Amino acid sequence: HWSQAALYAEVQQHQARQMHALDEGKFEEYADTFTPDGVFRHTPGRDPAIGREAIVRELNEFHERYAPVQRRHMFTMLAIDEDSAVQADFYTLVLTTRVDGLTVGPSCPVRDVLVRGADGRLLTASRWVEHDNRTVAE
Amino acid sequence: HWSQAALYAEVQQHQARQMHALDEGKFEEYADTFTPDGVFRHTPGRDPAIGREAIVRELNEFHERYAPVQRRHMFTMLAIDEDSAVQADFYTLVLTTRVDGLTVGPSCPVRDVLVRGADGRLLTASRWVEHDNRTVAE
Amino acid sequence: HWSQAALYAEVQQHQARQMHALDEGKFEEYADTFTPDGVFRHTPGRDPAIGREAIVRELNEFHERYAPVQRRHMFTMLAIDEDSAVQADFYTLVLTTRVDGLTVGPSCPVRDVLVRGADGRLLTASRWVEHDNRTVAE
Protein backbone atom coordinates (compact mmCIF):
# COMPACT_ATOMS: atom_id res chain seq x y z
CA HIS A 1 0.00 0.00 0.00
CA TRP A 2 1.01 3.54 -0.91
CA SER A 3 -0.40 4.67 2.51
CA GLN A 4 1.79 2.22 4.50
CA ALA A 5 4.78 3.58 2.57
CA ALA A 6 3.69 7.16 3.12
CA LEU A 7 3.36 6.45 6.85
CA TYR A 8 6.89 4.99 6.97
CA ALA A 9 8.40 8.20 5.42
CA GLU A 10 6.24 10.28 7.69
CA VAL A 11 7.65 8.56 10.80
CA GLN A 12 11.23 9.03 9.50
CA GLN A 13 10.55 12.77 8.91
CA HIS A 14 8.97 13.12 12.38
CA GLN A 15 11.88 11.36 14.14
CA ALA A 16 14.51 13.38 12.26
CA ARG A 17 12.90 16.73 13.17
CA GLN A 18 12.60 15.61 16.81
CA MET A 19 16.34 14.92 16.98
CA HIS A 20 17.27 18.09 15.08
CA ALA A 21 15.47 20.01 17.86
CA LEU A 22 16.92 17.92 20.74
CA ASP A 23 20.51 17.87 19.51
CA GLU A 24 20.47 21.66 19.10
CA GLY A 25 19.16 22.17 22.64
CA LYS A 26 15.62 23.15 21.66
CA PHE A 27 14.01 21.18 24.51
CA GLU A 28 10.55 22.89 24.35
CA GLU A 29 10.39 22.13 20.63
CA TYR A 30 11.31 18.51 21.26
CA ALA A 31 8.69 18.21 24.03
CA ASP A 32 6.03 19.66 21.71
CA THR A 33 6.53 16.68 19.41
CA PHE A 34 5.13 14.43 22.17
CA THR A 35 1.49 14.20 23.25
CA PRO A 36 0.59 16.40 26.30
CA ASP A 37 0.56 13.09 28.28
CA GLY A 38 3.65 11.71 26.56
CA VAL A 39 5.86 9.08 28.25
CA PHE A 40 9.67 9.51 27.83
CA ARG A 41 11.67 6.63 29.39
CA HIS A 42 15.18 7.76 28.43
CA THR A 43 17.14 5.67 30.94
CA PRO A 44 16.63 2.12 32.33
CA GLY A 45 16.24 2.10 36.11
CA ARG A 46 14.89 5.67 36.09
CA ASP A 47 11.18 6.55 36.03
CA PRO A 48 9.91 8.14 32.79
CA ALA A 49 9.20 11.83 32.35
CA ILE A 50 5.43 12.03 31.72
CA GLY A 51 4.14 15.22 30.14
CA ARG A 52 5.81 18.05 28.25
CA GLU A 53 6.84 20.10 31.26
CA ALA A 54 8.46 17.01 32.85
CA ILE A 55 10.34 16.24 29.62
CA VAL A 56 11.65 19.82 29.42
CA ARG A 57 12.55 19.82 33.15
CA GLU A 58 14.26 16.40 32.84
CA LEU A 59 16.32 17.60 29.85
CA ASN A 60 17.30 20.80 31.72
CA GLU A 61 18.42 18.85 34.84
CA PHE A 62 20.46 16.45 32.65
CA HIS A 63 22.06 19.36 30.72
CA GLU A 64 22.97 20.98 34.10
CA ARG A 65 24.76 17.82 35.40
CA TYR A 66 26.56 17.06 32.07
CA ALA A 67 26.95 20.16 29.73
CA PRO A 68 30.99 22.30 25.76
CA VAL A 69 29.58 19.42 23.83
CA GLN A 70 27.57 18.49 20.69
CA ARG A 71 25.45 15.34 20.73
CA ARG A 72 23.92 13.70 17.61
CA HIS A 73 21.37 10.87 17.68
CA MET A 74 21.30 8.60 14.63
CA PHE A 75 18.33 6.30 14.01
CA THR A 76 18.45 3.22 11.80
CA MET A 77 16.47 -0.01 11.31
CA LEU A 78 12.95 1.40 11.53
CA ALA A 79 10.14 -1.18 11.55
CA ILE A 80 6.56 -0.04 12.05
CA ASP A 81 3.41 -1.98 12.96
CA GLU A 82 -0.38 -1.60 13.81
CA ASP A 83 -6.53 1.68 13.63
CA SER A 84 -4.90 4.98 14.71
CA ALA A 85 -1.74 4.39 16.81
CA VAL A 86 1.45 3.08 15.21
CA GLN A 87 4.30 1.29 16.98
CA ALA A 88 7.84 1.96 15.80
CA ASP A 89 10.87 -0.23 16.60
CA PHE A 90 14.33 1.09 15.77
CA TYR A 91 17.97 1.51 16.71
CA THR A 92 19.64 4.66 18.06
CA LEU A 93 23.36 5.39 17.99
CA VAL A 94 24.56 8.32 20.19
CA LEU A 95 27.54 10.45 19.05
CA THR A 96 29.09 13.06 21.31
CA THR A 97 31.69 15.52 20.09
CA ARG A 98 33.77 17.25 22.75
CA VAL A 99 36.95 19.32 22.62
CA ASP A 100 39.02 16.17 23.32
CA GLY A 101 37.23 14.03 20.76
CA LEU A 102 34.25 12.01 19.60
CA THR A 103 32.59 9.30 21.68
CA VAL A 104 30.46 6.63 20.02
CA GLY A 105 27.72 4.88 21.93
CA PRO A 106 25.70 3.72 23.61
CA SER A 107 23.52 1.86 21.13
CA CYS A 108 19.89 1.82 22.20
CA PRO A 109 16.95 -0.24 20.88
CA VAL A 110 13.87 1.97 21.16
CA ARG A 111 10.13 1.53 20.91
CA ASP A 112 7.94 4.60 20.04
CA VAL A 113 4.17 4.73 19.95
CA LEU A 114 2.88 7.41 17.60
CA VAL A 115 -0.57 8.96 17.21
CA ARG A 116 -1.99 11.77 15.09
CA GLY A 117 -2.82 15.13 16.77
CA ALA A 118 -5.86 17.35 16.01
CA ASP A 119 -4.07 19.03 13.04
CA GLY A 120 -3.07 15.65 11.52
CA ARG A 121 0.62 15.77 12.46
CA LEU A 122 2.29 12.84 14.24
CA LEU A 123 2.98 13.05 17.95
CA THR A 124 4.97 10.65 20.11
CA ALA A 125 2.71 9.19 22.83
CA SER A 126 5.51 7.02 24.21
CA ARG A 127 9.29 6.57 23.83
CA TRP A 128 10.79 3.58 25.58
CA VAL A 129 14.61 3.52 25.42
CA GLU A 130 16.69 0.46 26.32
CA HIS A 131 20.56 0.62 26.60
CA ASP A 132 22.68 -2.22 25.20
CA ASN A 133 25.32 -1.73 27.93
CA ARG A 134 22.59 -2.31 30.56
CA THR A 135 21.50 -5.45 28.70
CA VAL A 136 25.06 -6.77 28.52
CA ALA A 137 25.53 -5.92 32.24
CA GLU A 138 24.82 -9.28 34.07
CA HIS B 1 6.19 6.67 -9.14
CA TRP B 2 4.32 6.02 -5.90
CA SER B 3 5.08 2.26 -6.39
CA GLN B 4 8.87 2.80 -6.64
CA ALA B 5 8.64 4.81 -3.41
CA ALA B 6 6.48 2.18 -1.77
CA LEU B 7 9.02 -0.49 -2.77
CA TYR B 8 11.86 1.55 -1.23
CA ALA B 9 10.06 1.75 2.17
CA GLU B 10 9.16 -1.89 1.89
CA VAL B 11 12.83 -2.89 1.50
CA GLN B 12 13.80 -0.69 4.49
CA GLN B 13 11.06 -2.37 6.62
CA HIS B 14 12.17 -5.84 5.47
CA GLN B 15 15.86 -5.17 6.23
CA ALA B 16 15.10 -3.68 9.65
CA ARG B 17 13.00 -6.69 10.73
CA GLN B 18 15.72 -9.06 9.49
CA MET B 19 18.31 -7.37 11.69
CA HIS B 20 15.97 -7.10 14.69
CA ALA B 21 15.69 -10.91 14.51
CA LEU B 22 19.43 -11.53 13.91
CA ASP B 23 20.72 -9.12 16.55
CA GLU B 24 18.44 -10.71 19.16
CA GLY B 25 19.66 -14.21 18.31
CA LYS B 26 16.51 -15.35 16.51
CA PHE B 27 18.43 -17.21 13.79
CA GLU B 28 15.46 -19.31 12.47
CA GLU B 29 13.43 -16.12 12.11
CA TYR B 30 16.26 -14.45 10.23
CA ALA B 31 16.67 -17.48 7.94
CA ASP B 32 12.94 -17.46 7.19
CA THR B 33 13.34 -14.00 5.66
CA PHE B 34 15.47 -15.58 2.89
CA THR B 35 14.21 -17.75 0.04
CA PRO B 36 14.46 -21.54 0.68
CA ASP B 37 17.44 -21.44 -1.76
CA GLY B 38 18.84 -18.20 -0.36
CA VAL B 39 22.55 -17.33 -0.71
CA PHE B 40 24.22 -15.71 2.36
CA ARG B 41 27.87 -14.69 1.71
CA HIS B 42 28.65 -13.12 5.09
CA THR B 43 32.46 -13.25 4.88
CA PRO B 44 34.92 -12.76 1.96
CA GLY B 45 37.09 -15.83 1.39
CA ARG B 46 34.43 -18.12 2.89
CA ASP B 47 31.81 -19.98 0.82
CA PRO B 48 28.21 -18.77 1.24
CA ALA B 49 25.59 -20.54 3.30
CA ILE B 50 22.94 -21.65 0.77
CA GLY B 51 19.52 -22.52 2.15
CA ARG B 52 17.78 -21.80 5.44
CA GLU B 53 19.19 -24.73 7.38
CA ALA B 54 22.74 -23.79 6.30
CA ILE B 55 22.18 -20.17 7.36
CA VAL B 56 20.91 -21.27 10.79
CA ARG B 57 23.77 -23.79 11.17
CA GLU B 58 26.35 -21.17 10.06
CA LEU B 59 25.00 -18.65 12.59
CA ASN B 60 25.05 -21.29 15.37
CA GLU B 61 28.69 -22.29 14.60
CA PHE B 62 29.73 -18.60 14.58
CA HIS B 63 27.88 -17.91 17.88
CA GLU B 64 29.68 -20.97 19.40
CA ARG B 65 33.19 -19.70 18.42
CA TYR B 66 32.51 -16.03 19.44
CA ALA B 67 29.62 -15.60 22.03
CA PRO B 68 28.29 -12.00 26.70
CA VAL B 69 27.78 -9.64 23.84
CA GLN B 70 25.15 -7.55 21.98
CA ARG B 71 25.63 -6.85 18.28
CA ARG B 72 23.67 -4.24 16.27
CA HIS B 73 23.76 -3.90 12.47
CA MET B 74 22.99 -0.45 11.09
CA PHE B 75 22.12 -0.01 7.40
CA THR B 76 22.43 3.27 5.52
CA MET B 77 22.70 4.47 1.91
CA LEU B 78 20.09 2.21 0.32
CA ALA B 79 19.87 2.36 -3.48
CA ILE B 80 17.54 -0.01 -5.31
CA ASP B 81 17.35 -1.00 -8.99
CA GLU B 82 15.53 -3.35 -11.51
CA ASP B 83 10.19 -7.28 -13.68
CA SER B 84 10.06 -9.10 -10.30
CA ALA B 85 13.48 -9.18 -8.59
CA VAL B 86 14.98 -6.03 -7.07
CA GLN B 87 18.66 -5.38 -6.38
CA ALA B 88 19.58 -3.40 -3.28
CA ASP B 89 22.96 -1.73 -2.66
CA PHE B 90 23.71 -0.37 0.80
CA TYR B 91 26.15 0.14 3.65
CA THR B 92 26.29 -1.80 6.92
CA LEU B 93 27.97 -0.64 10.11
CA VAL B 94 28.50 -3.30 12.84
CA LEU B 95 28.34 -2.30 16.53
CA THR B 96 29.28 -4.73 19.28
CA THR B 97 28.69 -3.98 22.95
CA ARG B 98 30.63 -6.07 25.45
CA VAL B 99 31.26 -5.73 29.17
CA ASP B 100 34.54 -3.89 28.44
CA GLY B 101 33.04 -1.56 25.87
CA LEU B 102 31.68 -0.84 22.41
CA THR B 103 33.48 -1.77 19.19
CA VAL B 104 32.64 0.00 15.94
CA GLY B 105 33.21 -1.69 12.61
CA PRO B 106 33.73 -3.22 10.24
CA SER B 107 31.91 -1.25 7.57
CA CYS B 108 30.54 -3.49 4.84
CA PRO B 109 29.13 -2.62 1.39
CA VAL B 110 26.38 -5.16 0.68
CA ARG B 111 24.33 -6.22 -2.30
CA ASP B 112 20.92 -7.94 -1.70
CA VAL B 113 18.65 -9.43 -4.32
CA LEU B 114 15.02 -9.46 -3.24
CA VAL B 115 11.99 -11.29 -4.62
CA ARG B 116 8.36 -11.62 -3.55
CA GLY B 117 7.18 -14.90 -1.96
CA ALA B 118 3.80 -16.62 -2.56
CA ASP B 119 2.06 -14.45 0.10
CA GLY B 120 3.45 -11.20 -1.40
CA ARG B 121 6.07 -10.53 1.28
CA LEU B 122 9.69 -9.79 0.33
CA LEU B 123 12.32 -12.49 0.70
CA THR B 124 16.08 -12.17 0.33
CA ALA B 125 17.27 -14.45 -2.51
CA SER B 126 20.89 -13.33 -2.08
CA ARG B 127 23.03 -11.31 0.36
CA TRP B 128 26.57 -10.59 -0.75
CA VAL B 129 28.68 -8.92 1.98
CA GLU B 130 32.04 -7.27 1.30
CA HIS B 131 34.33 -6.03 4.18
CA ASP B 132 36.15 -2.70 3.85
CA ASN B 133 39.11 -4.00 5.89
CA ARG B 134 39.53 -6.84 3.33
CA THR B 135 39.39 -4.27 0.52
CA VAL B 136 42.00 -2.06 2.18
CA ALA B 137 44.17 -5.17 2.84
CA GLU B 138 46.69 -5.20 -0.11
CA HIS C 1 0.42 12.88 0.59
CA TRP C 2 1.74 9.95 -1.45
CA SER C 3 3.85 12.50 -3.46
CA GLN C 4 5.56 13.93 -0.33
CA ALA C 5 6.41 10.35 0.65
CA ALA C 6 7.61 9.53 -2.84
CA LEU C 7 9.83 12.63 -2.77
CA TYR C 8 11.34 11.56 0.57
CA ALA C 9 12.35 8.12 -0.84
CA GLU C 10 13.59 9.79 -3.97
CA VAL C 11 15.95 12.04 -1.99
CA GLN C 12 17.24 9.02 0.01
CA GLN C 13 17.91 7.12 -3.27
CA HIS C 14 19.65 10.17 -4.79
CA GLN C 15 21.87 10.72 -1.72
CA ALA C 16 22.81 7.03 -1.49
CA ARG C 17 23.88 6.85 -5.16
CA GLN C 18 25.89 10.07 -4.74
CA MET C 19 27.87 8.56 -1.87
CA HIS C 20 28.28 5.18 -3.58
CA ALA C 21 30.02 7.10 -6.41
CA LEU C 22 32.10 9.35 -4.09
CA ASP C 23 33.23 6.63 -1.69
CA GLU C 24 34.41 4.49 -4.62
CA GLY C 25 36.42 7.37 -6.09
CA LYS C 26 34.09 8.08 -9.01
CA PHE C 27 34.45 11.87 -8.72
CA GLU C 28 33.05 12.74 -12.21
CA GLU C 29 29.98 10.63 -11.45
CA TYR C 30 29.51 12.38 -8.12
CA ALA C 31 29.91 15.82 -9.75
CA ASP C 32 27.30 14.91 -12.37
CA THR C 33 24.73 14.54 -9.59
CA PHE C 34 25.04 18.30 -8.94
CA THR C 35 23.66 21.07 -11.13
CA PRO C 36 26.22 22.56 -13.61
CA ASP C 37 26.31 25.58 -11.22
CA GLY C 38 26.28 23.45 -8.08
CA VAL C 39 27.72 24.76 -4.78
CA PHE C 40 29.74 22.24 -2.68
CA ARG C 41 30.87 23.69 0.69
CA HIS C 42 32.62 20.61 2.10
CA THR C 43 34.72 22.34 4.77
CA PRO C 44 34.02 25.33 7.09
CA GLY C 45 36.51 28.16 6.59
CA ARG C 46 37.15 27.08 2.98
CA ASP C 47 35.34 28.56 -0.04
CA PRO C 48 32.92 26.21 -1.83
CA ALA C 49 33.66 24.45 -5.09
CA ILE C 50 31.14 25.91 -7.59
CA GLY C 51 30.53 23.92 -10.75
CA ARG C 52 31.24 20.33 -11.74
CA GLU C 53 34.81 20.84 -12.89
CA ALA C 54 35.66 22.62 -9.60
CA ILE C 55 34.09 19.78 -7.59
CA VAL C 56 36.11 17.18 -9.51
CA ARG C 57 39.31 19.27 -9.22
CA GLU C 58 38.70 19.85 -5.47
CA LEU C 59 38.19 16.11 -4.89
CA ASN C 60 41.37 15.30 -6.87
CA GLU C 61 43.48 17.83 -4.88
CA PHE C 62 42.11 16.42 -1.59
CA HIS C 63 42.78 12.80 -2.69
CA GLU C 64 46.38 13.85 -3.60
CA ARG C 65 47.08 15.37 -0.13
CA TYR C 66 45.40 12.50 1.83
CA ALA C 67 45.16 9.14 -0.14
CA PRO C 68 45.45 3.21 1.04
CA VAL C 69 42.11 4.05 2.51
CA GLN C 70 38.34 3.41 2.19
CA ARG C 71 35.91 6.12 3.29
CA ARG C 72 32.15 5.60 3.81
CA HIS C 73 29.62 8.39 4.39
CA MET C 74 26.49 7.45 6.32
CA PHE C 75 23.44 9.73 6.27
CA THR C 76 20.69 9.68 8.88
CA MET C 77 17.94 11.98 10.16
CA LEU C 78 16.65 13.29 6.84
CA ALA C 79 14.04 16.07 7.06
CA ILE C 80 12.82 17.74 3.88
CA ASP C 81 10.91 20.99 3.33
CA GLU C 82 9.52 23.39 0.58
CA ASP C 83 7.19 24.89 -5.82
CA SER C 84 10.22 23.13 -7.42
CA ALA C 85 13.28 23.21 -5.12
CA VAL C 86 13.43 21.07 -1.98
CA GLN C 87 15.61 21.67 1.07
CA ALA C 88 17.05 18.66 2.87
CA ASP C 89 18.48 18.69 6.41
CA PHE C 90 20.37 15.64 7.64
CA TYR C 91 23.29 14.16 9.54
CA THR C 92 26.45 12.64 8.07
CA LEU C 93 28.81 10.27 9.85
CA VAL C 94 32.23 9.70 8.19
CA LEU C 95 33.95 6.28 8.50
CA THR C 96 37.50 5.73 7.30
CA THR C 97 39.08 2.29 7.13
CA ARG C 98 42.86 2.17 6.91
CA VAL C 99 45.39 -0.63 7.33
CA ASP C 100 45.82 0.33 11.02
CA GLY C 101 42.11 0.57 11.73
CA LEU C 102 38.78 2.34 11.49
CA THR C 103 38.26 6.00 12.38
CA VAL C 104 34.80 7.30 13.23
CA GLY C 105 33.92 10.94 12.71
CA PRO C 106 33.53 13.74 12.21
CA SER C 107 29.76 14.10 12.45
CA CYS C 108 28.45 16.78 10.12
CA PRO C 109 25.01 18.44 9.95
CA VAL C 110 24.34 19.16 6.27
CA ARG C 111 21.85 21.18 4.28
CA ASP C 112 21.20 20.21 0.59
CA VAL C 113 19.05 22.08 -1.89
CA LEU C 114 17.68 19.82 -4.60
CA VAL C 115 16.05 20.60 -7.94
CA ARG C 116 14.84 18.49 -10.86
CA GLY C 117 16.90 18.42 -14.09
CA ALA C 118 15.51 18.40 -17.67
CA ASP C 119 15.05 14.58 -17.63
CA GLY C 120 13.18 14.68 -14.28
CA ARG C 121 16.01 13.31 -12.11
CA LEU C 122 17.07 15.11 -8.93
CA LEU C 123 20.23 17.21 -8.92
CA THR C 124 21.97 18.83 -5.96
CA ALA C 125 22.06 22.62 -6.46
CA SER C 126 23.79 23.18 -3.12
CA ARG C 127 25.49 21.14 -0.36
CA TRP C 128 26.42 23.03 2.77
CA VAL C 129 28.45 20.94 5.24
CA GLU C 130 29.06 21.98 8.85
CA HIS C 131 31.53 20.04 11.15
CA ASP C 132 30.60 19.37 14.78
CA ASN C 133 34.26 19.62 15.87
CA ARG C 134 34.37 23.16 14.40
CA THR C 135 31.17 24.01 16.27
CA VAL C 136 32.54 22.66 19.56
CA ALA C 137 35.83 24.56 18.93
CA GLU C 138 35.41 27.86 20.94
User: How far is it, in rounded angstroms, from Cα C41 to Cα C48?
Assistant: 4
User: How far is it, in rounded angstroms, from Cα C80 to Cα C14?
Assistant: 13
Q: Do B12 and A78 touch (CB under 8 A)?
A: yes
In Å, how far is B89's CA from the nearest CA of chain C?
9
Q: Do B78 and C13 touch (CB under 8 A)?
A: yes
* CB neighbour class for B60 (10 Å; exposed up to 12, middle 13-18, buried from 19): exposed
CB contact burial C43-72 (16+ within 10 A = b; e otherwise): eeeeebbbbbebbbebbeeeeeeeeeebbb
In Å, how far is A48's CA from the nearest CA of chain C?
24
C-alpha closest to that of A137 among A91, A92, A110, A106: A106
Question: Considering CB atoms only, which of B8, B109, B138 is closest to C13?
Answer: B8
Contact in structure between C75 and C92 (CB atoms under 8 Å): yes
Q: What chain B residue is nearest to C74 in terms of C-alpha separation? A: B76
C-alpha closest to that of B13 among A11, A124, A18: A11
Question: Considering CB atoms only, which of C8, C89, C135 is closest to A9?
Answer: C8
Question: Considering CB atoms only, which of C3, C6, C20 is closest to B79?
Answer: C20
CA dihedral (A74, A78, A82, A83) positive or negative: positive
CATH architecture of C2-138: Roll (3.10)
CA angle C121, C82, A10 (to 5 degrees): 85
Question: Considering CB atoms only, which of C8, C74, C136 is closest to A69?
Answer: C136
User: How far is it, in rounded angstroms, from Cα B102 to Cα C102?
Assistant: 13
Q: Give chain A positions within 8 Å (CB) of B3.
A: 2
> Which residues are within 8 A (CB) of C85 and not within 5 positions of it... i.e. 6 or more apart?
C113, C114, C115, C125
Domain ranges of chain C: 2-138
User: How far is it, in rounded angstroms, from Cα B7 to Cα C94?
Assistant: 28
Is C67 an interface residue toward B (CB < 8 Å)? no
Q: Phi and psi dihedrals of B21, rounded to 5?
A: -70, -50
Q: Give chain A positions within 8 Å (CB) of B95.
A: 93, 105, 107
User: How far is it, in rounded angstroms, from Cα A91 to Cα A111?
Assistant: 9
Q: Give chain A positions within 8 Å (CB) of B101.
A: 105
Listed in sequence order, the DSSP H helices in chain A are 2-23, 27-31, 52-66, 132-136
Contact in structure between C35 and C51 (CB atoms under 8 Å): no
C-alpha closest to that of B24 among A132, A79, A128, A95: A132
User: How far is it, in rounded angstroms, from Cα A73 to Cα A95?
Assistant: 6
The data reach a resolution, in angstroms, of 2.5
Q: Do C5 and B5 touch (CB under 8 A)?
A: yes
Contact in structure between B92 and B105 (CB atoms under 8 Å): no
> What crossing angle do the helices spanning A2-23 and C2-23 adopt, rounded to 10°?
70
Query: Quick check: bond before C48 cis, omega within 30?
Result: no
E strands, C52-100, are 69-81, 85-98
| A32, HSE (Cβ side, Cα atoms, 13 Å) | 7
The counts of H helices and E strands in chain A are: 4, 6
